[PDB]
Design a binder for these strands. Structure first.
Ligand SMILES: [Cl-]
Ligand SMILES: [Cl-]
Ligand SMILES: [Cl-]
Ligand SMILES: [Mg+2]
Ligand SMILES: [Mg+2]
Ligand SMILES: [Mg+2]
Ligand SMILES: [Mg+2]
Ligand SMILES: [Mg+2]
Ligand SMILES: [Mg+2]
Ligand SMILES: [Mg+2]
Ligand SMILES: [Mg+2]
Ligand SMILES: [Mg+2]
Ligand SMILES: [Mg+2]
Ligand SMILES: [Mg+2]
Ligand SMILES: [Mg+2]
Ligand SMILES: [Mg+2]
Ligand SMILES: [Mg+2]
Ligand SMILES: [Mg+2]
Ligand SMILES: [Mg+2]
Ligand SMILES: [Mg+2]
Ligand SMILES: [Mg+2]
Ligand SMILES: [Mg+2]
Ligand SMILES: [Mg+2]
Ligand SMILES: [Mg+2]
Ligand SMILES: [Mg+2]
Ligand SMILES: [Mg+2]
Ligand SMILES: [Mg+2]
Ligand SMILES: [Mg+2]
Ligand SMILES: [Mg+2]
Ligand SMILES: [Mg+2]
Ligand SMILES: [Mg+2]
Ligand SMILES: [Mg+2]
Ligand code: NA
Ligand code: NA
Ligand code: NA
Ligand code: NA
Ligand code: NA
Ligand code: NA
Ligand code: NA
Ligand code: NA
Ligand code: NA
Ligand code: NA
Ligand code: NA
Ligand code: NA
Ligand code: NA
Ligand code: NA
Ligand SMILES: [Sr+2]
Ligand SMILES: [Sr+2]
Ligand SMILES: [Sr+2]
Ligand SMILES: [Sr+2]
Ligand SMILES: [Sr+2]
Ligand SMILES: [Sr+2]
Ligand SMILES: [Sr+2]
Ligand SMILES: [Sr+2]
Ligand SMILES: [Sr+2]
Ligand SMILES: [Sr+2]
Ligand SMILES: [Sr+2]
Ligand SMILES: [Sr+2]
Ligand SMILES: [Sr+2]
Ligand SMILES: [Sr+2]
Ligand SMILES: [Sr+2]
Ligand SMILES: [Sr+2]
Ligand SMILES: [Sr+2]
Ligand SMILES: [Sr+2]
Ligand SMILES: [Sr+2]
Ligand SMILES: [Sr+2]
Ligand SMILES: [Sr+2]
Ligand SMILES: [Sr+2]
Ligand SMILES: [Sr+2]
Ligand SMILES: [Sr+2]
Ligand SMILES: [Sr+2]
Ligand SMILES: [Sr+2]
Ligand SMILES: [Sr+2]
Ligand SMILES: [Sr+2]
Ligand SMILES: [Sr+2]
Ligand SMILES: [Sr+2]
Ligand SMILES: [Sr+2]
Ligand SMILES: [Sr+2]
Ligand SMILES: [Sr+2]
Ligand SMILES: [Sr+2]
Ligand SMILES: [Sr+2]
Ligand SMILES: [Sr+2]
Lengths: 73, 56, 237, 46
RNA sequence: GUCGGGUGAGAACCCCGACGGCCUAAUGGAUAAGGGUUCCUCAGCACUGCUGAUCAGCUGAGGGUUAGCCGGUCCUAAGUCUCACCGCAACUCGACUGAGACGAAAUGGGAAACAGGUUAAUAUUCCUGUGCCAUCAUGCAGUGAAAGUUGACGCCCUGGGGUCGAUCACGCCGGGCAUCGCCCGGUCGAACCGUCCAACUCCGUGGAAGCCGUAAUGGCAGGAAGCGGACGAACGGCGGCAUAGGGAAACGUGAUUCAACCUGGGGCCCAUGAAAAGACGAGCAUGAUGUCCGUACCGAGAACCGACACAGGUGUCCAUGGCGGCGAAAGCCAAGGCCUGUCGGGAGCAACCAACGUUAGGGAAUUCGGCAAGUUAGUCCCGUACCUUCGGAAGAAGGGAUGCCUGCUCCGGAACGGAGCAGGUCGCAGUGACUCGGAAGCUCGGACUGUCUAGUAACAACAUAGGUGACCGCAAAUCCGCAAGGACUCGUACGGUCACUGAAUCCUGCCCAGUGCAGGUAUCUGAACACCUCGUACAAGAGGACGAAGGACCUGUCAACGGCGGGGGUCUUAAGGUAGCGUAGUACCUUGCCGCAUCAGUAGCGGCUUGCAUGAAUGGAUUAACCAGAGCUUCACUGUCCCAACGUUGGGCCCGGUGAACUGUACAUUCCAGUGCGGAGUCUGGAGACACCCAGGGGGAAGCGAAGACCCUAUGGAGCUUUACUGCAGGCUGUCGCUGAGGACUCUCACUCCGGGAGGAGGACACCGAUAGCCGGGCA
RNA sequence: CGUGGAAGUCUGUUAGAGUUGGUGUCCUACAAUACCCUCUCGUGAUCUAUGUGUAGGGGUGAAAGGCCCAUCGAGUCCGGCA
């Protein structure tokens, strides 16, 4: 998704940002139904396009390994 | 752009206007303070000892 | 010489201040008497320009709309509890004594009832460890052990907006846009590229600092540049 | 530029100060206006 | 500009007509700021106007600016001020906090006006017509009334609706044209009152297991398409307005593309995109009231700023006038404005200079260097290398095509939209003017975009993402203040502070001896106070005892300042140059040696390299891409040169008018020698020399211009550095007061902080006043 | 293959901003920093109007000792001052 960077910037610019952008424009699980309709709304804000469950989550990744630790205890 | 003649073009601002108290074109309408009589800054009148040679 | 950049800072002029008028809210905790009879439904999840991470719009039992700091997972429709006997669910605000051990907690208070001081940034947490009658040890994000008062309120769960610092800025344009909304002067001109008259590391026919970078803690403001009270420097060795 | 009421009263008087010394003052003193102002060459107040 | 003509004592430049041009985002229209009467009329020419003037922004005297509905006024914005409070020796000083006020005239919010007519000059203000808003009064309605909505909001892409405009069709009205019958202009008509609704959301019906739908994304058994329906848009349509108005007349009808205006869908953010007053919620009739301030003109190559009627500078709206073409591009032309970027006359008009055209043959031989100029050039098709971070390179390169006419096929609803085929035919030339890349290759630097020395430096310097290190748990680190107090901070380690290096990729060796910083320290050193001894009827005073930070001293640390040699097969002072790179922007010797390239190469590229004196974040190496960055080579091109010629326009020369300045000890027609303070028109000797004037190019007057910036001197100045001198901030530390109860400790009562409060934390410490020792270019 | 329409992307005398070379013109100027041709950027760390804040050993400074009204290695005025 970092093809807008052109001949400039570098490898770590088009590997990391492109990875974390192809990962967020994807289909993720929702806690109010169980569907793949989770889209982004900005920095940290995650929204479902079903019964529009506008929730919280990791900046670019919906569920961080730190945000899943709250479930264990 | 040179600091001389061409920079003199952007000079269409009003700062010093005729004062209410003394009447000299020294009332800074943006500061609401007079540079001659001190209207808007002091209750007294702006006078200074250096406005005249020491022993006069 | 002249006053260095860090001296012009403390003056508090427009250039160095934070655009407070463009900021949302002073995220604090609610004042319950004693009993936990307060609860609230999360209506919205907004963006905080003051601290980048998401901020939850909560409407309470008595209709008091206040913006609270948002922990991971919490969404619209969800109910949270604020008070002494609150539920041990993510997003609920209750004192350290009432919170069990080995639980990741955030928005921790220093002195009880200050509205929260510690563990607030994007995705951080705090580990609650020892439980006595006098003390409640908490492990802060830096790894420091803070011996806290058990009467100090805290929100259960990790902060939302995690893993933000893990993605690069790519361009200065992205850094510009960020810094315009904070209390910082940007860009950063190295003290070495300056004149002798402007900084202690300034001057010279080439670029290098005059004296060694490490400076005494007793150093006066205007000479306190570089490595302030370094116990060491470098990577390996 | 928008002038106020007082500003108008003033610019008004300055225009009457621009009138010549009448023909009879010359015949009474048996033979010069010093506050002679031009709209281009001179500068007024405000 | 030219010929006529007008007024006039007087006319190149004042005015009429004609003919001829100039301006097209402005040289037109409306305005903000600023100007201030410069607007209008009449009378004038002593002043001002680059000449003249009968003209004028000039001079003199009159006249001119009319608003409930256009601004202001009101609202609040960054932010400002006053009062209180507090500090200060004090204030006109200063931070917090409370309260009030001010803060927006184009261009934030906002109750309400349109069409025409009128003047020498105003105009939604006056006048005619019509309409609209508010408060209030009376009469009717109504008891709802405040929940909610509105005011009120980022950027990028996009569909829908839709007016003006422009163009096409046809009809009517008026004009132009003189082979044809084409060409131009007009065909009008507001606000407001009424009414219609797409999009959107939603309800009922329905019952899809694959369908529905889009420019795209999408949508659905938690209920799709289809069907009916509630709410619901324009600055739009339709009706009224209007036997109003305007028009000499006709006083149209349809269409496409559609600014404005309306309404949706979509995407981006380590950026999240004002507030408040007011309005809506929530009726109607009649009547009344709606004060106050602005209102002229300019808005620029003459009304502003720049001393000027200055080639400079200065915001906004008209971004849809016609052809053109991708185009708000060029070129040409309307509407409109102008001939005032305001001196003229004459000479084939010389030399010489500024812009500039064409130059045979050669083609960079010119020069430090292709400086200057030039070459290519739009669109279509074929084709496109090394390398590469896979994005790019790349429009690489290279090759072909390109008009007009006739008749057609295809895409689409269609355009006055696009793409194609066949035959016909003109020129030297078909992107025919205009618009419109020259191409390639090697090396250096910096990654990139960006920043900069307003006015001789745009660059390799600055910045940047990226990398690293340092300090801090918030009563923090860092910083401002004399204090009261404040910035960071509506912030909290995924933070912000202080520094360094400078994308990515591959790495980043060795040394902690010195300096720095930090930690520890048995022992040494270590100030004042208090204590102990002697001395004083007391004071001064002599010694002792104790002892903090600090120093000694030990340890840690170089992505911390820095270092990585000589000698021999160790020594200084810790180690003693590892990867790479290398005659370098670093190498003196040096035009290093070999090679490539040229006839010839102090250049350039490659290799070697003992490196005077390369080298790892004082970052080392490599590099795709990028660059008005430095160097070199080739192809192409050319007046750069061989070597200069002709031409073009404005000057230059002569005539009218206008009319400065730089410079001037005096004398002065010089030249060749000499002499002299050694660089003479002027002295000595000779030579030469009739006077004046025109043009010239500048040899001389050590020409003019500037009390040399160089250099030295002066017991000159300043900016800057530091282990110069001395001091001050400031930090650290002991001590005395604040300061209380029972060399280690308990308490709460002062004091501090936190909680709204209850009360909670801390506690004689801390803060502050005083003193003492250390550090102390941060400052003098 | 298409749809889509990203960008400190691209060409661009679109508005606008900047100022490389000519070391051209000018240099008692049109101008106490101008003219012309060339050249650069032109959806962004962009350009601009008005309002507002920071003040002299102090501001501001993508750092050039740059800028703070033709004044900057410490503004200007008046005084100290003859
Ligand atoms: Cl940051
Ligand atoms: Cl107005
Ligand atoms: Cl749509
Ligand atoms: Mg210094
Ligand atoms: Mg800022
Ligand atoms: Mg908060
Ligand atoms: Mg920097
Ligand atoms: Mg420098
Ligand atoms: Mg460097
Ligand atoms: Mg360095
Ligand atoms: Mg008059
Ligand atoms: Mg008029
Ligand atoms: Mg003129
Ligand atoms: Mg020739
Ligand atoms: Mg030669
Ligand atoms: Mg068809
Ligand atoms: Mg660069
Ligand atoms: Mg310059
Ligand atoms: Mg440049
Ligand atoms: Mg960095
Ligand atoms: Mg960093
Ligand atoms: Mg650099
Ligand atoms: Mg190293
Ligand atoms: Mg060599
Ligand atoms: Mg070289
Ligand atoms: Mg010197
Ligand atoms: Mg000196
Ligand atoms: Mg307090
Ligand atoms: Mg000094
Ligand atoms: Mg050139
Ligand atoms: Mg400003
Ligand atoms: Mg310098
Ligand atoms: Na004037
Ligand atoms: Na004339
Ligand atoms: Na309507
Ligand atoms: Na057109
Ligand atoms: Na750019
Ligand atoms: Na060492
Ligand atoms: Na070295
Ligand atoms: Na550039
Ligand atoms: Na020529
Ligand atoms: Na001469
Ligand atoms: Na100096
Ligand atoms: Na694709
Ligand atoms: Na130029
Ligand atoms: Na000063
Ligand atoms: Sr200029
Ligand atoms: Sr201006
Ligand atoms: Sr005041
Ligand atoms: Sr006085
Ligand atoms: Sr508080
Ligand atoms: Sr707080
Ligand atoms: Sr230095
Ligand atoms: Sr190491
Ligand atoms: Sr003037
Ligand atoms: Sr005359
Ligand atoms: Sr006139
Ligand atoms: Sr007001
Ligand atoms: Sr307005
Ligand atoms: Sr349309
Ligand atoms: Sr007018
Ligand atoms: Sr105008
Ligand atoms: Sr102009
Ligand atoms: Sr015309
Ligand atoms: Sr004239
Ligand atoms: Sr010919
Ligand atoms: Sr050559
Ligand atoms: Sr040569
Ligand atoms: Sr070609
Ligand atoms: Sr490099
Ligand atoms: Sr500049
Ligand atoms: Sr690197
Ligand atoms: Sr050391
Ligand atoms: Sr070696
Ligand atoms: Sr001459
Ligand atoms: Sr761009
Ligand atoms: Sr461009
Ligand atoms: Sr040069
Ligand atoms: Sr010049
Ligand atoms: Sr030229
Ligand atoms: Sr564009
Ligand atoms: Sr003096």
């Amino acid at each position: 998704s970092s093809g807008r960077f052109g001949a400039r910037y570098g490898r770590v610019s088009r590997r990391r940002v492109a990875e974390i952008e192809s990962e967020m424009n994807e289909d993720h699980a929702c806690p109010n139904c169980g569907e793949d309709r989770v889209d982004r709304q900005g920095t940290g804000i995650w929204q479902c396009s079903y019964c529009d469950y506008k929730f919280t989550g990791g900046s670019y990744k919906p569920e961080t390994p730190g945000g899943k630790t709250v479930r264990r205890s | 752009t040179g600091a001389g003649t061409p920079s003199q073009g952007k000079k269409n601002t009003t700062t010093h206007t005729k004062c209410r108290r003394c009447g000299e074109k020294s009332y800074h309408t943006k500061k609401k303070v007079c540079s001659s009589c001190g209207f808007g800054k002091s209750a007294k009148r702006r006078d200074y000892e250096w406005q005249s040679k020491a022993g006069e | 010489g002249r006053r260095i950049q860090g001296q012009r800072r403390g003056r508090g002029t427009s250039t160095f201040r934070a655009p407070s008028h463009r900021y949302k809210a002073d995220l604090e905790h609610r004042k319950v008497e004693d009993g936990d009879v307060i609860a609230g439904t999360v209506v919205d999840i907004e963006h905080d320009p003051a601290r980048s991470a998401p901020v939850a719009a909560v409407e309470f039992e008595d209709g008091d709309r206040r913006l609270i700091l948002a922990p991971e997972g919490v969404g619209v429709g969800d109910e949270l509890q604020v008070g002494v006997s609150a539920e041990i669910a993510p997003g609920n605000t209750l004192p350290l004594a009432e919170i069990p051990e080995g639980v990741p907690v955030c928005n921790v208070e220093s002195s009880p009832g200050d509205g929260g001081k510690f563990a607030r940034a994007s995705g951080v947490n705090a580990q609650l460890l020892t439980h006595d009658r006098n003390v409640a040890v908490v492990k802060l994000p830096s790894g420091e052990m803070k011996r806290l008062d058990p009467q100090c309120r805290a929100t259960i769960g990790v902060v939302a907006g995690g893993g933000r610092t893990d993605k690069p800025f790519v361009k200065a344009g992205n850094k510009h846009h960020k810094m315009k909304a904070r209390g910082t002067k940007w860009p950063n001109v190295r003290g070495v590229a300056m004149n002798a008259v402007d900084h202690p590391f300034g001057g010279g026919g080439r670029q290098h600092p005059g004296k060694p970078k490490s400076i005494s803690r007793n150093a006066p403001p205007g000479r306190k540049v570089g490595d302030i009270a370094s116990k060491r420097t470098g990577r390996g060795g | 530029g928008k002038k106020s009421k007082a500003t108008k009263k003033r610019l008004a008087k300055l225009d009457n100060q621009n009138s010549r010394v009448p023909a009879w003052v010359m015949l009474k003193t048996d033979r010069r206006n010093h506050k002679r102002r031009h709209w281009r060459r001179n500068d007024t107040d405000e």
